[PDB]
Design a protein around this ligand. Sequence first.
Ligand SMILES: Cn1nc(-c2ccc(F)cc2)cc1C(=O)O
Ligand SMILES: [Zn+2]
Length: 354
Amino acid sequence: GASKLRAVLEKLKLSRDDISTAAGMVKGVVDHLLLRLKCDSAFRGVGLLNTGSYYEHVKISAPNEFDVMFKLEVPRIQLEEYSNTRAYYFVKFKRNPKENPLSQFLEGEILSASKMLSKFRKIIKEEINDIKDTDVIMKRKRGGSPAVTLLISEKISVDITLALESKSSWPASTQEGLRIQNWLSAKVRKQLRLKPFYLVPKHAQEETWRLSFSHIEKEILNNHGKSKTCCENKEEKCCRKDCLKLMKYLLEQLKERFKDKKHLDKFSSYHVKTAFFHVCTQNPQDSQWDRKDLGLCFDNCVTYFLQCLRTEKLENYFIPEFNLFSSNLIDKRSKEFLTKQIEYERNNEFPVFD
Ligand SMILES: Cn1nc(-c2ccc(F)cc2)cc1C(=O)O
Ligand SMILES: [Zn+2]
């Protein structure tokens, strides 16, 4: 029951905690990019999102794949929702010193993502060659975010996303989102909602940006209990983080198994992570997440995610009217394929964790 799950969580811990020079190679490459980008008119205010975090792993089993975010403070930003999408926006400016650092990317009153990504990719291309230390090659694929993919030596890949940062109130599409009031409290919601938000270049091909709150997600996960003391007693933690890891590895393993088929290509840890936050709101009490009940708690997540694929509904945790499971985003057959693969996993004591 929880035996296989515990063994899985223990191997994942050991693979994550093991000694590697990977993060060292990555830190040096990034610090180098940042110092080059800073002596440029457009990117003088560029910085790492979380200062101290380079080893940010989206994949729970990939210790050689890194995900880094470079944020750029955009003061006096004006947002205009694109085509009732709730999550995609045009970036405009209120403007007084109109010859602003980003004026070079303006296509009318509109901030071009394409023009900003071009300049950014170019400066990064210029710094990659100038490196005499390690073997770094700039892999380019169709995608606004991650803007860049670097490959340091073998297996060490780094995804770089450029993100605009806004320190203004969150867009109206978020007003009913982050329903943590009965779990984390109403005062925690007000405090997180006073924090900045990020816009990443992304299409739903227009010059649009997608809202990003992964820094709020990171804060929640490190202070996730109804009680302020949750997991401070290491002998009696809750199994919240474990259930999330297991949901991520389940999907990772199913994607690896069916990589030749194209059916699971559109699913990502983001879908499984969002579903897990919806189960947190559903089950707000720390007693609903006992370390002893790992198996049952994991089943609660599996069943809820399964309900989501079947009903074709998975709301974005921050933007309630953004449906991650819409038929225009992911077609029914792909969803039915995932439901079938997950149902087989549950009914065969998750063979993907063998
Ligand atoms: C599949 N997906 N959707 C998002 C998303 C992010 C912000 C939004 F407002 C809406 C959607 C991120 C991912 C991912 O990481 O795959
Ligand atoms: Zn806890």
